[PDB]
Design a protein around this ligand. Sequence first.
Ligand SMILES: Cc1ncc(COP(=O)(O)O)c(CNCC(=O)O)c1O
Ligand SMILES: Cc1ncc(COP(=O)(O)O)c(CNCC(=O)O)c1O
Lengths: 98, 466, 466, 75
Amino acid sequence: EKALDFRPKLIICGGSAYPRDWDYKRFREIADKCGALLLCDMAHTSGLVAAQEVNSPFEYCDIVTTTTHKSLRGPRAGMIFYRKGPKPPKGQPENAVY
Amino acid sequence: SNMDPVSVWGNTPLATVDPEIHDLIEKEKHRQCRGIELIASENFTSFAVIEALGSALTNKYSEGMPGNRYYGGNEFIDQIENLCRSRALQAFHLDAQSWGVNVQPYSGSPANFAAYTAVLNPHDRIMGLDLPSGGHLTHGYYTSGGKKISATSIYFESLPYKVNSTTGYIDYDRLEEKALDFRPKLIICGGSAYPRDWDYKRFREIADKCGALLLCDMAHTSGLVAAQEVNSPFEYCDIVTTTTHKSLRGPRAGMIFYRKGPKPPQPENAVYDFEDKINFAVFPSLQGGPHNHQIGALAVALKQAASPGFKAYAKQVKANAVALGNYLMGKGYSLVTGGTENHLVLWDLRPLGLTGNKVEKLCDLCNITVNKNAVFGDAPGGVRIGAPAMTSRGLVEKDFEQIGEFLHRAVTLTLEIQKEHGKLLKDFNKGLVNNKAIEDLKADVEKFSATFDMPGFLVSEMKYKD
Amino acid sequence: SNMDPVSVWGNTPLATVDPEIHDLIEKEKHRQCRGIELIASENFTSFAVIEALGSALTNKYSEGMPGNRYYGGNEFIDQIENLCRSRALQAFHLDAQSWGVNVQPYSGSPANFAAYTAVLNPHDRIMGLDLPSGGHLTHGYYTSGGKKISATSIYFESLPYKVNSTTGYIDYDRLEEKALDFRPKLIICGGSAYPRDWDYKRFREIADKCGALLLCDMAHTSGLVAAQEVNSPFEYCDIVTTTTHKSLRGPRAGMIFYRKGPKPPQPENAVYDFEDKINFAVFPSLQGGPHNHQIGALAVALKQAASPGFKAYAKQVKANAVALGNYLMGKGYSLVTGGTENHLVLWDLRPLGLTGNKVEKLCDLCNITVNKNAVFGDAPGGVRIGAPAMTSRGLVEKDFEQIGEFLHRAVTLTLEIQKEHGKLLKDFNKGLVNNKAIEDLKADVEKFSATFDMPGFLVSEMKYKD
Amino acid sequence: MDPVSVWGNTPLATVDPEIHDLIEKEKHRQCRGIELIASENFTSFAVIEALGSALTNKYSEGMPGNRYYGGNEFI
Ligand SMILES: Cc1ncc(COP(=O)(O)O)c(CNCC(=O)O)c1O
Ligand SMILES: Cc1ncc(COP(=O)(O)O)c(CNCC(=O)O)c1O
């Protein structure tokens, strides 16, 4: 409801103190309905994501950002993952690419 | 090789200088007294207003405020503007120690945008009534696709609030919740197709809780406000904007009212700082020279609005809208909120399976002018209908019931044409060509309208009398 | 308890409805024909324009474009607007396949701001002529202290360009250098106190080199442009805005011209995309309903401007400005650029040790209306003087030399009063009370002005004939 | 759901033309004939207005002051 009212260009999912997994499919559904990009900040659960122990944001998000020093157990740094190549089928022109 | 003499180019009447524009105006004068004018933002103003509007006042440049002008020749312009300002305050029963007014806005949309410029920075947050809920373009409008339509939404960050989906009244609780989330610097109240009064007290409570300025755009009901026939926004709002041509029955112009003096209990004995910001926003920020013929005509309209006849006019407008609304409901038509507390009715046509487009088109052909209008959760689904213009021609309740019957016939015809030719506009249009029933209704409308008086010009002197 | 009858409130003349505003207008009509009106942005328009301005056209709401309106009743409004648009194109000798025009702007400042809204995003960069170099507020203005005054500088990022400090002409080379540094999306040309013609060809070269749109605001000289008496901005500019009340001699209104069709050699057969953006910026982005009485009056003014008499008027305006300028220089007065190529002269008073404030004040008291005006490297140091208004009353070169002599007497008096009472305004004012010489000059001015004809009303019918 | 006014505030003549017609015919029978039934009378319009009124919407079991539930201030 707030997304359809506010019309964000970008919806962020992921958090710092949320003890449950995320329904990225529903986030994708909401983002598609309102016309937004969808970004996951998986900083906290990046290690669990890499180990395939929580839902993967990559299946539904356009961009995935993370730190490297929390559950990923690396140095202090950041990474930005982004989709490349042809866009999946969507009022979208054929041959559309990321 | 020589200039035309002043008498040839400058003193000759319009009928001779420009027969083609003179003819077109006479045709428009005839259209105005031979149809039923139900556009809720229209009115028929007085001859005295039109005489001041069309006067030498158009020749004078006078940038600035009276007493603080950028150049001279303003001895009389200053008195006319000072008179307009003082009559504005009197017509709305305002103490000059508590309220000031700027009467230079060219129209209502410039008035609103100058108010925003005065008290907001670019990209500051604003909320106003959503357009499908009865709000106005200048209160903010962007599409589902994110296209920013209103300049309000281009230069500020707007978020609409809506009516309650069950009742059609403002949803005050959802507005409070949204204002606390969004944190607007400015909340706008008033609208263009809302048929109920406003709880300005509750708007002030929401604005105080979230830290917002509160502005009312009373353009549509300004005449009812001046006559004290609806709630007064001045009791609770920091700023009040308005047009002057709708229910106020004046020229096309705008005004900005603003509070002065002590603020309610912030530092002690803190005072409002609107006056200088608002005057400066109008000039030199946004406008150039005032349109002094509009200001003089507006001063006339504000004198007329302060009269006992105008108080009776405003009562009659309300009574006419109610009488028309009740007539339509009696025929099984659906009104938004099931009635009206002001000058308009909002007629939801979706229960009939009709669009606003078809009903507006069909009785435009019968000389009945309404406007298709969005309705909640909408190809507009309704039509908006106003009483101010026909009330100004002298009509009363039973005349507005006859207007109800003409509308009942028109929508009956619309249903028949849609049933026989189809719902696509291309197909629906087939039923509009050489339709005896349309011609019949148009003839009935024109005979009805011709019986009434007409302000602003003499029907006895007009070129097209047939 | 009853409404006033339509004849009482709605058909009674202004003289009876509002004697106080009627009296003030008659006094302003008298001031207009008993003084010397040298405000360069003023004119005296025709009775035919005033009759259309003051007409039933004020009653019609018509949001949208003709043929694409939001509601009905617009059969005749559409023809009047379509006629206005076509006459606008004809008066400026424009091919309709290459140029379109929007005639709804309320005034020149709304016209400019709508043009910016059409083609720029918020905070896009703009350059226009600096105010002390003769530019206009709407072209951008912020103070030394950084305060953003113009709405152009509030909502966009403006940077001024200046005249050459030696010659007073536009410094085209420094503008090119600045445009390449600042990289504006929009460069504005035209101004309000620049006394020379514009090299639009060079502006197009600078705009092409830096990638900018090019817009001319021809408000002041529009009438000279239509008469082909100055360079045409249309040869080189993407967009042309204007007011219609200054040298064009029309109502107070604005217009936006824009290119259509193929662009000059970018993709092949690429075309201009201004029309839809400009129409949409005017409505629904910024304005509400058009002021249809202004549009009809403007259509009249555009017919009059297309006449051989108007071409002769525009020549005479130029000849009158030159004759006045030459008279003043002969008395040892300093003009900016040492002359004029258009309708105004800019008189630099600093060599005399005088301010614009004193000279404007003193001959306002003698019924001579000028405006103090900033001059390069400035308490404005000069006065601006225009020929359009008095030329419209029929004056020719030797009448403008008499006007020169009245100004020579006024500035002589100003010097004497400043010498005898002092330079501080408080002290200078002491010499303005019961000054026989001022009274004498005022009497001479009034006898001079009373001999000339007056457009727009009949001096034979006015209330104050003495 | 219909809009309230469409079903709830429209007149009998259009909601139910057959019943409206039958009542109109019975009103006509009542004043074109000689009604000599000793147990019949013609009551007043004032009585009929109170009879067809919002009072029909109120349940008020029990007695004034001694009711089974609330809302009976005016009943
Ligand atoms: C060049 C120019 N452009 C636009 C405007 C604005 O016109 P409006 O007042 O209609 O908004 C002016 C007014 N200039 C007034 C003067 O120079 O005296 C102007 O000089
Ligand atoms: C509430 C409101 N505010 C401002 C305006 C703008 O007025 P101008 O056209 O003078 O700019 C309108 C116009 N509303 C037109 C209508 O509802 O039909 C309005 O309805």
